[PDB]
Amino acid sequence: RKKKVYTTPKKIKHKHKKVKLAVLSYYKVDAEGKVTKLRRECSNPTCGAGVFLANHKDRLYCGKCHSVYKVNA
Amino acid sequence: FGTASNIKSRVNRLSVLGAITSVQQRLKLYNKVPPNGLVVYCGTIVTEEGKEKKVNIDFEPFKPINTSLYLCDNKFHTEALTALLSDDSKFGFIVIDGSGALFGTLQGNTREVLHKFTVDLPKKHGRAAQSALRFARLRMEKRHNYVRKVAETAVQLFISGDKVNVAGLVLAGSADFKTELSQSDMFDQRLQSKVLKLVDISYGGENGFNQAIELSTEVLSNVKFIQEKKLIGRYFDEISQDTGKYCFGVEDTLKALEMGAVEILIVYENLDIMRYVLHCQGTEEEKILYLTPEQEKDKSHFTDKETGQEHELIESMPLLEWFANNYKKFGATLEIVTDKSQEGSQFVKGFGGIGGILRYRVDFQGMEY
Amino acid sequence: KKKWSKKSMKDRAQHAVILDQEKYDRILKEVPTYRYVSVSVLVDRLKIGGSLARIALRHLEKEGIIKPISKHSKQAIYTRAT
RNA sequence: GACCCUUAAC
RNA sequence: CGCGGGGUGGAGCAGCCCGGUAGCUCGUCGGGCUAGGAACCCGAAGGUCGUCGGUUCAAAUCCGGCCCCCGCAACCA
RNA sequence: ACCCACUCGGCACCUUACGAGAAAUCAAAGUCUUUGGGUUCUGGGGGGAGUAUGGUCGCAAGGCUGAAACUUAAAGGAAUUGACGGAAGGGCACCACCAGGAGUGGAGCCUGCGGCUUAAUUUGACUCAACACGGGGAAACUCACCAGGUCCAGACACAAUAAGGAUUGACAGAUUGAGAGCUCUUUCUUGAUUUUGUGGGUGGUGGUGCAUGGCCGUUCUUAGUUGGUGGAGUGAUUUGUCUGCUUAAUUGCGAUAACGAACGAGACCUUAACCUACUAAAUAGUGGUGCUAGCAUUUGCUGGUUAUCCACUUCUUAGAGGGACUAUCGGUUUCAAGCCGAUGGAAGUUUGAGGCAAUAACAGGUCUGUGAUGCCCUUAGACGUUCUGGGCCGCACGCGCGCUACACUGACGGAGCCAGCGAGUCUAACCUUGGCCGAGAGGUCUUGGUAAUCUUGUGAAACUCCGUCGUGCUGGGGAUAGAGCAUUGUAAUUAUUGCUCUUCAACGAGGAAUUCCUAGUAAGCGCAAGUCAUCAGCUUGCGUUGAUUACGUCCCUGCCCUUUGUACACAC
């Protein structure tokens, strides 16, 4: 037995419990009218028609596309 | 190696045979025994969290050593090294005889011979009438010459930088040749006032050095017994003055230490005040605290008030370790103290074991709640 | 440091290997009176080179003065006809 | 002819 | 405070019928013996000879200084 | 003076004998718990200690008398069994010697061990009975050791944010090589393992082989071990199991308080090789097919389409009466089992060799083979599970097992060519056969046998006509460097391995010491297999060429048996 100092920082990082935030899915307030779909997806037939195009700022994120998503307007 | 080859237990056998071999090779690394000796240790130290290594520690002591030791045991034996570390007082021995003089130094254990010389004495017999007294006074004058030469040689080997380093001077000899040396005027005033005792030895030279140590074994220890009473004596005399510089309790006397003054700080050999280094993670705040000997083994206060978070036990450092980092700021002498003496016994049992002298009479209770 | 050697002396052998007229006609006049003639016999008596001994032996059998009896390699056994 | 010794270490 | 010797490996001795640029023993180290110690066997290392200055025929032995080990004389009024 | 028979007295003399004794043993040491003939002296656990404060005798040396303190759990007697003996008598063994042989130790190198690098050099094994052993070459895993985000399979309480949706798969960012973001100013297609005080866990080449199983290592590499019944002794035990006779044998012959048995030895099992008849295919010479390459028109020396075969089997192939049992004989021994010689037969001290191989034992080794097994501040940051990079693949040194040499009986160049074990193919490219020009290596193609006809009629190293240097640190030199060429390997830089080129490096019958060896053995030589991703200086098997004594001894270190001494008892 010589020593054990644990130079790497204190990394007891057990997973969180998913602390609840406020209610979500604020699509719109559309009473007595046509109900459309949000996050319109690509023309590729392999899209599951249930995923969300996370397009924040000129960058598009799609769950169905594993690593590549490139389209031109 | 052979006697260890028939240890019944394999775990003991292999360890001892390997330990002996590793000692052998490190001794093979040394061509000769260095001065101050060579202290060797082999084994397997035990820390926490399981990362094994076999250690091999040989070093030359900073101070000369006299003890010899070889012990194979389930634990390391450092008691000789601790004693050689604690005992630092040096006592000079002067062995004066008509045949010659010797000067020696005595640490806690080791015995060194600084400088010894022989002298041809004249003939006591004068067997004259019209010149007996002239030769008798002449013979006395040569004795004075030898007394002074021994006296001046004492200053050269013991006094260094206009300060005496040896704790005390033991003047050993026979046939009244040490009484005159101690009472001689040419003998240094500081060294004469440091004369410990006169010892009647049956032999001169190195043999008288051995016998002088044997007859002065208890007195050398009693020197620290004497300086111990003197250190606290000025502390208690200032108490008997009924003056305003009275303090008690570690909680207060440490505040006095942090304020200033404190000519001398008194620290016990076996401190009862164990302190834990604390460090909070959240607020990023660092502070200093103090603890009591009796309210730390079992108390329901061991929780977090500032943040209310659990704290794992941290390795604890002594107060002497922290105070030794900056013990020179106050200039106070680090003196290990005892509790044997009755006056000291009530000081420990009534006054907290820490005291100091203030430069002037200043009020503490004036600013209090 | 010790190297555990003996390092004996040497005789400084001087086996000549390119032969001149003095050696050429010496061996020619001395190949008689030699009951047994071989490669080692030539070099240990006329102090010629090892290759000269076998080459000269081939010369003495080409013209023919010394009559070989055993033509084995590593050991040449030639006698002289009488 | 010569031939001494043998663990504290479960 | 005179007169004499001596100083060569860790230790003891070889250059004293004026010169082998230093050798022989113990000790130490390595190997082998033996089931390890010892004893034994086989090998190896170790000092430019107290220091400084003088003839320059391998000179430092033998010369002159200081230090060290010692030894004898230290009397008659 | 002898001989017989008495007798008294004496020195003695033959027994685990009625009796006595703890036994040894005892003609008294008996007549003694069935205790008494007379009488003197002495002892009461060991030591201190026959040690005087004393006394007495003595010239003295010393004699006689003679404690205590204190300290001990034993000391001691006689046997038994074993172990041991620089004790004796026998018998043995080349892990012993003798006559020797080849050597090792000496050189370089390859392996395996023994401290240290405040970073690991994983580890067990310390005489035989470890140290080319762990079947232990490591591109990397194997792997344990080190540096490194660190993902985990609750069995029957649920102490609750359990639809306040308890939860996974993923962009990148100083820090994750990556179609391995675990949460992280941005959380998206199926979704009901819930998360930590905390009392059962499913793993670990973590430690304990002084907790164990099993397996393997000293003697049985050599003849030991043990019941039943009977005998002896109080008993531990002993006899059987033993004098002599021979033992590569507690093997037998045999005296015999033993008889009858069991285990071990032997016997048993495996090889070489003559049965020539229900052991062979053209998987081997074939006895006659068909003709070609030389001479004699007279009589050889080799190649062969593929289901006509013909009185087919003696060589590597191994069943059924087989065979070799000391034949017989010669001699030596109570002619008893049996040493030794003479023709004999594939072979003769049981034919050679090996396997199997008893009863106790060892704190022998192995927890690192095992999913064979209790403990380890163990069950969501770990020793578990892996992924990347490092490393017994590191050097002042010492030791063990080894390889190649120090050369003319030898090196090199031709050339001639000759064995035997044996292996080789599914989620197959292993066994390099020929037509890959290619040219050490391996990509093209695989025409290839339930592996004699394919590697391989093993077609090899060693060896052996003839020639190159001649005795030198020389052609005995890649030992050590540099430069380049190749294939196995998601990857070799601390040469993976093979190939071509430069220089001599130590080394010149190696000190003390030491090992193995009795026949086709030793020794020289090389090949297949294990390991293996090509290529291993090791092992296992083997096969080629083939040495001096074998009437041996115990002194040469150890075994076996017996007798004897012991104050030893895990036992010199």
Q: Give exposure, C9-31, as e/b (b: 16+ Cβ within 10 Å).
A: eeeeeeeeeebeeebeeebeeeb
At B116, give phi and psi (nearest 5°): -130, 140
Tokens 């021995």 -> residue: B93
Contact A2 B48 (CB under 8 A): no
CA of A13 and C1' of F28: distance in angstroms? 103
Please tell me the distance from the alpha carbon of residue B94 to that of residue B115, in angstroms, as a whole number.
Answer: 10
SS3 content of chain C, % helix, strand, coil (to 5): 35, 15, 50
CA of B310 and C1' of F156: distance in angstroms? 34
C-alpha distances in angstroms, C73 versus B30, C39, C68? Answer: 65, 11, 13
Q: Is the CB of B9 under 7 A from strand D?
A: yes
Q: Residue B306 CB: number of other CB atoms within 10 A?
A: 10
Q: Is B190 helix (H, G, I), strand (E, B) or coil?
A: helix
Residue nearest to nucleotide F408 (CA to C1'): C74
Strand D nucleotides with an atom less than 7 Å from a protein beta carbon: 6-10
CA of B100 and C1' of E6: distance in angstroms? 25
Chain B: give the shortest CA distance to residue A1, in Å. Answer: 4
Tokens 């794992």 -> residue: B312
Q: Which of residues 49-68 of C touch strand F (CB under 7 A)?
A: 49-51, 53-55, 58
Please tell me the distance from the alpha carbon of residue B163 to that of residue B340, in angstroms, as a whole number.
Answer: 31
Please tell me the distance from the alpha carbon of residue B151 to that of residue C80, in angstroms, as a whole number.
Answer: 112
At B73, give phi and psi (nearest 5°): -145, 165
Please tell me the distance from the alpha carbon of residue B173 to that of residue B209, in angstroms, as a whole number.
Answer: 9
Q: Please, which residues 23-82 of chain B have a Cβ atom closer than 8 Å to chain A?
A: 44-53
Q: Is the CB of B55 under 7 A from strand F?
A: yes
Q: Positive or negative CA dihedral for A18, A23, A28, A34?
A: positive
- Tokens in use for B40? 């060797």
- Tokens in use for C61? 């059998």
Instruction: Enumerate the β-bridge partners of residue B106.
Output: B91, B111
Nearest by Cα to B263 from B232, B225, B229: B232
Considering just the CA atoms, what is the radius of gyration of chain A in Å? 22
Please tell me the distance from the alpha carbon of residue B304 to that of residue C2, in angstroms, as a whole number.
Answer: 75
Burial class (CB in 10 A: 0-12, 13-18, 19+), A43: exposed
Q: Is B137 helix (H, G, I), strand (E, B) or coil?
A: helix
Nearest by Cα to B154 from B165, B144, B141: B165
Cα-to-chain-centroid distance, residue B249? 27
Q: Is B276 helix (H, G, I), strand (E, B) or coil?
A: coil
Chain A: give the shortest CA distance to residue B204, in Å. Answer: 53
Resolution value (Å, 1 decimal) = 2.3
CA of B280 and C1' of F529: distance in angstroms? 70
C-alpha distances in angstroms, B218 versus B198, B325, C47? Answer: 14, 34, 98
- Tokens in use for B15? 């360890």
Report the neighbours of C using a cutoff of 3 or more CB pairs below 8 angstroms.
Answer: none
- Tokens in use for B103? 């000067």
Chain B: give the shortest CA distance to residue A34, in Å. Answer: 52
